[PDB]
Ligand binder design. Structure first.
Ligand SMILES: [Ca+2]
Length: 257
């Protein structure tokens, strides 16, 4: 099984072609942010009527496009991660979607067994990443990245570093790196069935960045109760240059491990 190993899990053959693979965590939580970015979203006719409380969900899947492309424990894959901010409560505005970030990937991942004094580098993935909100300017936001995802585990600990390199156009948000940084650290801790996690980015040169803490616990064998506390810049593309503290509670399928 090897909990948390995205690649190793994709190597596992699925009986049914419709049985997809989880890339990142999948959740749906009701949130409430400290401050709503009404300035960057001003062009919307519901902007001034926007509420700080909204349903935030994340859909993240992986599709092994070709196993063994580069060795027994390798795989060329594609993943899809979508984070959405929805004004479900805002009935006066017909519950509009404030923001949706479409982040598909293409990569070469490997399930590894490298020893790091207790730690084990289980995943070594390298690929292309596209992240856009599918909006037509002025609210147009998008960036491309060539990254490397490294994941190691040590007992109840999980650490994943995702350094990246921006490729292509970024005119929709030229200074996106000024808030997002050059990597994404991710720490998960297994306290029995409870999973504490941390996911953040930080620009050591600009002092900008953001991070999100999370706690989960199984409600059942498949679903889990999840509480998230995001704080900082880059929650979503539109708010990449916007600071805010968002706390939310809801359900989750899979956690980082
Ligand atoms: Ca543009």
């Amino acid at each position: 099984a090897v909990r948390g190993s995205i690649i190793a899990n994709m190597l596992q053959e699925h009986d049914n072609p419709f049985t997809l693979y989880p890339y990142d965590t999948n959740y749906l939580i009701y949130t409430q942010t400290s401050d709503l970015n009404k300035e960057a979203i001003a062009s919307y006719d519901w902007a001034e009527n926007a509420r700080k409380d909204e349903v935030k969900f994340q859909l993240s899947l992986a599709f092994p496009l070709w196993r063994g492309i580069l060795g027994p424990n390798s795989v060329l894959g594609a993943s899809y991660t979508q984070k959405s901010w929805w004004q479900l409560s805002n009935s006066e505005e017909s519950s509009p979607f404030r923001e949706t970030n479409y982040e598909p990937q293409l990569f070469l991942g490997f399930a590894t067994d490298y020893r790091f004094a207790g730690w084990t580098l289980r995943d070594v993935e390298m690929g292309y990443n596209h992240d856009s909100n599918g909006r037509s300017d002025p609210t147009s936001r998008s960036w491309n990245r060539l990254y490397t995802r490294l994941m190691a585990e040590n007992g109840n600990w999980l650490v994943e570093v995702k350094p990246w390199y921006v490729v292509g156009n970024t005119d929709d948000n030229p200074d996106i790196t000024k808030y997002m940084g050059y990597y994404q650290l991710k720490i998960g801790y297994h306290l029995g069935d409870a999973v504490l996690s941390a996911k953040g980015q930080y620009n050591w040169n600009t002092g900008y960045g953001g991070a999100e803490l999370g706690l989960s616990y199984p409600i059942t064998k498949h679903v889990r109760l999840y509480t998230q506390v995001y704080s900082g810049y880059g929650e979503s593309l539109i708010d990449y240059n916007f600071n805010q503290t968002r706390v939310g509670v809801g359900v989750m399928l899979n956690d980082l491990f």
